[PDB]
């Protein structure tokens, strides 16, 4: 049994970041990775995604090339190519990580970890036992795909992972999901050719965001050429000689249900879930407490119910983004190794950007969460709806919607929601501001940048 | 003599904005405009500019279309077209302004104003006299072009105005200036075809910005294909049968001066100055005090040395941007009409974005202004130099440089400087933060957006 000071299971974002801060404060640390380091962020998430998004933003422009006074192209985008190059980047990234870890002097034990009986907190890896007072579990989370029980033909669908394995742009895409990975997937395929359809249980996507966002984004997906199939779900999937035949039910409120066939489908995407990676961790042997869905349960300091065992990132099932993994992983290293009793991540005002077309940007709480936490009389909302100056000379148009949720007398900006061009790099500055309890005044006292979209967020009337 | 409560001379940004706030607080106001309302911002500045910049950003992409997996185009951009459309937009904008003013019920007296003898503050317009206790002078500023005395062939050069009148992209461009309108002009023409050259007195442009910016921007102009001609100035210009022949002197420090001919020049741009519009205002009749360069002199409340006479915008010669015109014009309306003794514009931390390729973004003071106001021991600078993920798959590359100037113990962020993709909509959030005395910690406590460039500004180490 090799004893350490820190043992971090999983080598993805949350975790790499912790072990790293731990080595920094002086600590005998190891990270147990089952396969590719960099986790999801590098391999099949953030990075591969943004590359494709970036590729998509190029079709949107190729469509406006004529309006801006240049001739045009024709079409035929070769997916094969961009695919290859995106992979060589993931490779470069992995090698950087390989080197970075080995240089910061961290024992990268490689293999599959699990908990044993061993009285005090101890893990095995490929028949070897390692232990250390503090073991952090950062085992991530995987894509949820339906069971053949419920949906016969379930296994025929592909997920984000498989999406990042596509060697050719699928001429006909079908996406099931109304969240962000769904919205994101639907947009890339549509922009890049595939006649796509987004099948959602209700009438709008991103039902978890502000009304304006969930609304404006369903609409934009529509004008973009996506096909929102509302109050629908796949009954069964059947591999024809053509491709796939999706039988889905459209049960619109107030109407009579109708069962439909969706033929010659190239790709059927399960963009419905991220189940935690907890099963074969064999937590059971320590009584490590969990969710009724496998997620590990921790307190406001990332402590499991067991002493010396913690959790961070996707696995815990809260704020499923890379930076929350990092911010939670590194903050821990300081509580422990710097002996800082106040280091914990404040899960409020966490900013999230969704890369649809156009980009969704948002931080803080929504009108409703607000109205509830304050009072219908206490919540004031300012908003704007304009057209980016980018479409003063284009036929192809998209909007930009900005909303500000203020609280109480002083008009404390407690929620900023927006969709529009540049909304990806637009948010962050305001996140810092918002994080530092900015009032509508501070916003209003800031001199504008003209001409910009951002200027609109500070001139709200 | 028609008496009012407010009389605003000039109908541009500063001014329209004031008169407007004045009408809002209940006031008999008028605005005396000599020609096109909207001033410079609409007609020959901000707006016409951003349209062209936007057009330029399209060539930069057309050059990367192949890398992103699509075929290509060929070249031949028709300037004629984009030109036309940009004008119809200025027209739409003017009409909006025409209507807006007439609806907010403001007497738009049209013609050329001037001050008379008349004991108490009084102006004439086309042989008509108007007066009112408060008269604001927002007469703007014009482009400075050399005198035939100094430079024989001076009048042969065109300025920003004329640039916005070009009906065809000039195959050979020559630009004299090392400031932002110069840098901006040089970039658009180069991206859009014209074999351009930027003749500057020294070795770098934007000598007024942070070292990093002034440096990185000279370099980027170079890799972009511009031609920085250092320690050079035009001796004389001569209209040949071909086009123009620029004779310029290259007096590099440590070398021997050399006089050179620059043949077949299509366009020679005077991007050197903005002299105030004060001459025929006939201030003289009131003793309205000024600069040794015509600029009006005011105090920290926009008061001239005469009671009941104020000044705002370009004319005053400070912070020559649209928003400073607005922020100064509207703040005045409240001091006066709302009777607010504290309404004045804090000219510190004013944010400015320069639209070069890539975009320059910056707010607060530089390392040097800082080091001086604090102490070489008291100023700490954090910085990053990375490549936007946009060029993970491109051959064509550009960087991104971010610098943070902190002050004292608490590491107060007192200056943010950057150049890079999306740096146009990136700045503003931080401007609010910076405006509210943000410390490096607040920056550091903000959860990141991944993947973004903005995330880099909050993870500075
Ligand atoms: C498409 C797509 C787009 C996304 N886009 C974004 C985005 O734009 N922005 C964003 O901020 N987030 C995004 N995410 C989510 C985000 O990347 C996750 O929150 C983030 O990956 C951090 O995860 P984590 O640290 O919990 O570890 P994970 O990334 O899940 O990685 C854990 C690592 O642990 C290893 N492992 C598992 N169990 C064990 C065990 N028994 N022992 C040893 N090794 C084991 C795994 O092999 C893996 O490499 C996206 C996800 C997908 C899929
Ligand atoms: C290229 C170019 C790009 C620019 N880009 C930007 C930018 O991106 N961002 C930015 O924020 N700023 C920019 N500016 C500068 C900015 O637009 C000025 O600060 C801004 O125009 C505000 O000016 P002002 O309010 O003092 O009035 P001005 O815009 O100069 O307008 C004054 C109006 O007054 C009228 N007038 C003059 N004298 C009299 C008198 N005797 N009586 C009656 N009428 C009279 C004029 O006809 C004019 O229409 C740019 C300028 C140029 C040229
Ligand atoms: S996808 C892995 C992810 N990376 C980030 O979040 C980058 C942000 C920040 N620079 C950071 O903290 O790394 C992540 O989960 N990283 C966490 C981790 O545990 N970090 C350990 C310490 C690593 N710090 C070393 C800094 C330089 C290392 N660089 C690389 O590993 C290569 N690139 C990156 O990791 C990221 C994503 S691949 N780089 C970029 O995104 C490019 C720059 C910019 N943010 C952009 O989006 O263009
Ligand atoms: S170029 C004139 C300039 N306009 C602005 O600075 C716009 C910012 C802000 N919305 C504003 O205060 O107008 C300016 O000098 N304006 C000052 C003026 O004196 N204002 C009087 C009151 C006008 N407020 C009415 C709001 C709606 C009016 N809209 C128009 O006049 C048309 N468009 C605009 O004025 C601007 C520039 S043409 N619109 C945009 O830039 C588009 C939106 C976004 N900012 C973008 O850049 O895409």
DSSP A175-244: EE-SSHHHHHHHHHHHHTT-EEEEE-SSS-S-TTS-HHHHHHHHHHHHHHT--EETTEEEEEEEE-SSSE
State how far the Cα of A175 lies from the Cα of A237, in Å rounded to an integer. 13
- Phi/psi for B364 (5° steps) reads 90, -165
Interface test with A, best of B188, B450, B461 (most A CBs within 10 A): B450
| Cβ proximity of B366 and B38 under 8 Å | no
Tokens 């910005």 found at: B209
What's CA B18's distance to the chain center, in Å? Answer: 20
B77 exposure class (CB count in 10 Å sphere: 0-12, 13-18, 19+): buried
Contact: A351, B447; criterion CB under 8 Å? yes
A72 and chain B in contact, CB less than 8 A: yes
B66 and chain A in contact, CB less than 8 A: no
Torsion from C-alpha of B107, B108, B110, B116, nearest 10 degrees: 50
B144: left (phi over 0), alpha (psi -120 to 50) or beta: beta
Q: Which atom of ligand 2 is nearest to the CA of B322?
A: 11
Burial B228-253 (b: 16+ CB within 10 A, else e): bbbbbebebbeeeeebbbbbbebeee
Between strands B401-407 and A232-239, the pairing is unpaired
Contact: A70, B78; criterion CB under 8 Å? yes
Of B321, B389, B430, the CB nearest to A432: B430
State how far the Cα of B298 lies from the Cα of B239, in Å rounded to an integer. 43
State how far the Cα of B139 lies from the Cα of A130, in Å rounded to an integer. 77
Question: What is the DSSP secondary structure assignment for residue B448, as one 8-state letter?
Answer: P
* CA B42 – ligand 4 centroid, Å: 9
B4 and chain A in contact, CB less than 8 A: no
* CA A211 – ligand 1 centroid, Å: 29
Contact: B449, A326; criterion CB under 8 Å? no
Q: Which residues, in sequence order, are CB contacts of B297 under 8 Å at separation 6+?
A: B289, B290, B291, B304, B305, B316
3-state helix vs strand vs coil in chain B, percent to 5? 30, 25, 45
B428 and chain A in contact, CB less than 8 A: yes
Tokens 């108490």 found at: B120
Method: X-ray
State how far the Cα of A19 lies from the Cα of A329, in Å rounded to an integer. 8
Tokens 């202004």 found at: B369
Question: What is the DSSP secondary structure assignment for residue A257, as one 8-state letter?
Answer: -
Contact: A73, B69; criterion CB under 8 Å? no
**Helices A13-24 and A322-337, packing angle to 10 deg:** 30
Ligand 2 close to Cβ of residue B328 (< 6 A): no
| Cβ proximity of A87 and A80 under 8 Å | no
As beta bridge partners, residue A173 has A196, A267
Strand order in the sheet with B309-311: B29-32, B6-9, B134-137, B309-311
Q: List chain A residues with CB under 8 Å of B326.
A: 448
| Cβ proximity of A37 and A92 under 8 Å | no
Of A50, A424, A433, the CB nearest to B433: A433
* CA A459 – ligand 4 centroid, Å: 10
Structure tokens at B418: 């950057």
A256 exposure class (CB count in 10 Å sphere: 0-12, 13-18, 19+): exposed
Q: How crowded is the C-beta side of A246, counted as CA atoms within 13 Å?
A: 27
Structure tokens at B333: 């309306």
Contact: B73, A65; criterion CB under 8 Å? yes
How close does chain B come to A83, measured CA to CA in Å? 9
State how far the Cα of A276 lies from the Cα of A430, in Å rounded to an integer. 32
| Cβ proximity of B319 and B298 under 8 Å | no
- Among protein residues, the one whose CA lies closest to atom 3 of ligand 2: B45
Burial B358-387 (b: 16+ CB within 10 A, else e): bbbbbbbbbbeebbeebeeeebebbebeee
Between strands B412-419 and A309-311, the pairing is unpaired
State how far the Cα of A387 lies from the Cα of A451, in Å rounded to an integer. 13
| Cβ proximity of A289 and A177 under 8 Å | no
Question: In A213-337, which ranges are E strands?
Answer: 228-229, 232-239, 244-250, 258-262, 267-270, 273-276, 309-311
Element containing residue A10 per DSSP (H, E):
none
Q: Which atom of ligand 1 is nearest to the CA of A17?
A: 25
* CA A454 – ligand 2 centroid, Å: 21
Which three-class secondary structure state does DSSP give residue A156?
Answer: helix
State how far the Cα of A14 lies from the Cα of A387, in Å rounded to an integer. 39
Torsion from C-alpha of B79, B85, B87, B88, nearest 10 degrees: 170
Question: In B304-452, which ranges are E strands?
Answer: 309-311, 351-354, 360-364, 379-385, 401-407, 412-419
| Cβ proximity of A139 and A114 under 8 Å | no
Element containing residue A353 per DSSP (H, E):
strand A351-354
- Catalytically active residues of A are 450
| Cβ proximity of B72 and B66 under 8 Å | yes
State how far the Cα of A229 lies from the Cα of A250, in Å rounded to an integer. 8
Structure tokens at A453: 């979209």
Which three-class secondary structure state does DSSP give residue A64?
Answer: coil
- Among protein residues, the one whose CA lies closest to atom 14 of ligand 3: A13
Contact: B76, A89; criterion CB under 8 Å? no
Between strands A122-125 and A128-131, the pairing is antiparallel
Give me Rg for the CA atoms of chain A.
Answer: 24
Interface test with A, best of B451, B457, B459 (most A CBs within 10 A): B451
Between strands A228-229 and A134-137, the pairing is unpaired
What's CA B139's distance to the chain center, in Å? Answer: 16
| Cβ proximity of A125 and A109 under 8 Å | yes
Between strands B195-199 and B122-125, the pairing is unpaired
Separation in Å, CA A394 to CA A450, A456, B166: 20, 21, 21
Q: Which residues, in sequence order, are CB contacts of B51 under 8 Å at separation 6+?
A: A389, A392, A393, B82, B85, B86, B89
Q: How crowded is the C-beta side of B352, counted as CA atoms within 13 Å?
A: 23
What's CA B368's distance to the chain center, in Å? Answer: 22
- Catalytically active residues of B are 450
Chain A residue nearest residue B343, CA to CA = A445
Neighbours of B322 (CB within 10 A): 25
State how far the Cα of A233 lies from the Cα of A246, in Å rounded to an integer. 10
> What domains are there in chain A, each with its CATH number?
1-143+273-348 (3.50.50.60), 144-272 (3.50.50.60), 349-461 (3.30.390.30)
Neighbours of B75 (CB within 10 A): 10
Separation in Å, CA B409 to CA A378, B380, B383: 38, 10, 18
How close does chain A come to B53, measured CA to CA in Å? 10
């Amino acid at each position: 049994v090799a004893s350490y000071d820190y043992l971090v299971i999983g080598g993805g974002s949350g975790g790499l970041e912790s072990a790293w801060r731990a080595a920094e404060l002086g600590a005998r640390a190891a990270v147990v990775e089952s396969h590719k380091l960099g986790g999801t962020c590098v391999n099949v998430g953030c990075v591969p995604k943004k590359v494709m998004w970036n590729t998509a933003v190029h079709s949107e422009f190729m469509h406006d090339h004529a309006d801006y006074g240049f001739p045009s192209c024709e079409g035929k985008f070769n997916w094969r190519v961009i695919k290859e190059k995106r992979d060589a980047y993931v490779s470069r990234l992995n090698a950087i990580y390989q080197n970075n870890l080995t240089k910061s002097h961290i024992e990268i034990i490689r293999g599959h970890a699990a908990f044993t009986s061993d009285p005090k907190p101890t893990i095995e890896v490929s028949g070897k036992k390692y232990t250390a007072p503090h073991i952090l579990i950062a085992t991530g989370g995987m894509p949820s795909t339906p069971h053949e029980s419920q949906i016969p033909g379930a296994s025929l669908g592909i997920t984000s992972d498989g999406f990042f394995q596509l060697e050719e742009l699928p001429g006909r895409s079908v996406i099931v999901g109304a969240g962000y990975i769904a919205v994101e997937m639907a947009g890339i395929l549509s922009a890049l050719g595939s006649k796509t359809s987004l099948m959602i249980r209700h009438d709008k996507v991103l039902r978890s965001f502000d009304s304006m966002i969930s609304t404006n984004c369903t609409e934009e997906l529509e004008n973009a050429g996506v096909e929102v199939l509302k109050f629908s779900q796949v009954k069964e999937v059947k591999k024809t000689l053509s491709g796939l035949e999706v039988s889905m039910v459209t049960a619109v409120p107030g109407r009579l249900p109708v069962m439909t066939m969706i033929p010659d489908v190239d790709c059927l995407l399960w963009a419905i879930g991220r189940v935690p990676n907890t099963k074969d961790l064999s937590l059971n042997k320590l009584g490590i407490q969990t969710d009724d869905k496998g997620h590990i349960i921790v307190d406001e300091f990332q402590n499991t119910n067991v002493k010396g065992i913690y959790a961070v990132g996707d696995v815990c099932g809260k704020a499923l983004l890379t930076p929350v993994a990092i911010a939670a992983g590194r903050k821990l290293a300081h509580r422990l190794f710097e002996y800082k009793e106040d280091s914990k991540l404040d899960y409020n005002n966490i900013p999230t950007v969704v890369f649809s077309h156009p980009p969704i940007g948002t931080v803080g709480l929504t009108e409703d969460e607000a109205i509830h936490k304050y009072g219908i009389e206490n919540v004031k909302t300012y908003s704007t709806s304009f057209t980016p100056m980018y479409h003063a000379v284009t036929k192809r148009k998209t909007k930009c919607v900005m909303k500000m949720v203020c609280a109480n007398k002083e008009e404390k900006v407690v929620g900023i929601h927006m969709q529009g061009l540049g909304c990806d790099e637009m948010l962050q500055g305001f996140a810092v501001a918002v994080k530092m309890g900015a009032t509508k005044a501070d916003f209003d006292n800031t001199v504008a940048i003209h001409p910009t979209s951002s200027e609109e967020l500070v001139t709200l009337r």
